[PDB]
Amino acid sequence: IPLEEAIQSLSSILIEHVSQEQYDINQDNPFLQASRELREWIKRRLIVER
């Protein structure tokens, strides 16, 4: 995935999960959440970007 496309798609996905009451609900900026979590997953070596 191109990184920007990836972060947009992930923000769209995370918008869905705003209904989960027990997992880190964001209702002010899901875009920043998606960016931060992509960076985090890169930190865990789950996803490597080249």
Partner 1 sequence: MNQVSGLAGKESFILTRIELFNWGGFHGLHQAAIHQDGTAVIGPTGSGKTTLVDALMTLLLANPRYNLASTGGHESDRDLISYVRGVSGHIARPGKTVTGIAATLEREGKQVRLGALLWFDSTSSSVTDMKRLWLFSDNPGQTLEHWLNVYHEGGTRLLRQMEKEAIGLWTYPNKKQYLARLRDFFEVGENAFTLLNRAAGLKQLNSIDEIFRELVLDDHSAFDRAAEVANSFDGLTEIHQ
Interface residues with partner 1 (CB under 8 A) are 2, 4-5, 7-9, 12
The least distance separating partner 1 from the CB of residue 42, rounded to whole angstroms, comes to: 18
Question: Buried b vs exposed e over 19-31: b needs ≥16 C-beta within 10 Å?
Answer: eeeeeeebeeebe
Identity of the residue, 9 or 24, whose beta carbon is nearer to partner 1 in the bound complex: 9
| Smallest separation, CB 22 to partner 1 (Å) | 27
Nearer to partner 1, 4 or 21 (CB): 4
In 3D, which of 1, 24, 2 has the Cα closest to residue 14? 24
* Token duo for residue 25: 């609900």
